[PDB]
Amino acid sequence: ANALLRYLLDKD
Amino acid sequence: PQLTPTLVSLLEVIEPEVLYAGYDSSVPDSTWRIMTTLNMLGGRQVIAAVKWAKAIPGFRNLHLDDQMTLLQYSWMALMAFALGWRSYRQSSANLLYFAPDLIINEQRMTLPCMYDQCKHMLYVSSELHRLQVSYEEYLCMKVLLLLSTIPKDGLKSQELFDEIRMTYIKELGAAIVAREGNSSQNWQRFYQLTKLLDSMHEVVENLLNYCFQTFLDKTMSIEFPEMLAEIITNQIPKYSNGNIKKLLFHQK
Numbered sequence A: 001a002n003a004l005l006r007y008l009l010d011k012d
Numbered sequence B: 001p002q003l004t005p006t007l008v009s010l011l012e013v014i015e016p017e018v019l020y021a022g023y024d025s026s027v028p029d030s031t032w033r034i035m036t037t038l039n040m041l042g043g044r045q046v047i048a049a050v051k052w053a054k055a056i057p058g059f060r061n062l063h064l065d066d067q068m069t070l071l072q073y074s075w076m077a078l079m080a081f082a083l084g085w086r087s088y089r090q091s092s093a094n095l096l097y098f099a100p101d102l103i104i105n106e107q108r109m110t111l112p113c114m115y116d117q118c119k120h121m122l123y124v125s126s127e128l129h130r131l132q133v134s135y136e137e138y139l140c141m142k143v144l145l146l147l148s149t150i151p152k153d154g155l156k157s158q159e160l161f162d163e164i165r166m167t168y169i170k171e172l173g174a175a176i177v178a179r180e181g182n183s184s185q186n187w188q189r190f191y192q193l194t195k196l197l198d199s200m201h202e203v204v205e206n207l208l209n210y211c212f213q214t215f216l217d218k219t220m221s222i223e224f225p226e227m228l229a230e231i232i233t234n235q236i237p238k239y240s241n242g243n244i245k246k247l248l249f250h251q252k
């Protein structure tokens, strides 16, 4: 869940 | 006698610029058009808030699930508080400054389904005005809102979280002192500002109730971007399950 959120947190 | 840079000086540097809504005003207003445009603007503001949060020293050291959880719980608090600040700074009037190209004055507030919501939002700018909050106080308070709500059973990095939160409580104190004002009343103002933080919980409760309602209403045809839709979908059950813990300064 909150996939876009996780994506933004986990990126360079 | 401080030999290190102030945290608030950093917060000033990482504060994101104001975004434009891209609202077309060559065509008559409608509640639907405004709400959709604001939702899309909100999505982008929240994305900018993620980058902002990651620039707060220590935040990235929290467990990734914790970083996610904090932003999910507080995105509305962050958005409403910044809205209040822009509104407070921009005018004297009773207006909401969502963006330089989307300002809602007393007139636009009479649009269908917009009065009660705007009133709840205007409360924030009203309070900031009443207390004459400074930019530095505002920046510290905004960080505390990010750290204002956690799961019922806490975070994975609870110890680091607590240390970070205490750090910005201290920094809020520093901002009060740095503020051009009454010295002997610093501790009273500390109470007043943390009282305002407590009341943001109710502000958010109201705005989220209406947001959730709109999001679930298939008759209103209002669009949400992926960012907000995912967060809202994930949060609705939690508020129902009571999986939430508001960190109150002045209540048990």
Ligand SMILES: C[C@@H]1C[C@H]2[C@@H]3CCC4=CC(=O)C=C[C@]4(C)[C@@]3(Cl)[C@@H](O)C[C@]2(C)[C@@]1(OC(=O)c1ccco1)C(=O)CCl
Pocket: B035, B036, B038, B039, B040, B041, B042, B043, B045, B076, B079, B080, B083, B098, B104, B113, B114, B117, B118, B207, B208, B210, B211, B212, B214, B215, B222
């Ligand atoms: C009352 C809610 C709260 C609103 C958010 C407040 C906080 C916020 C501030 C912004 O600057 C941009 C976007 C949001 C994140 C808002 Cl305005 C929008 O998505 C729109 C939101 C959810 C909301 O806004 C309104 O109804 C509204 C704003 C002005 C008149 O009505 C809504 O449910 C519409 Cl889908």
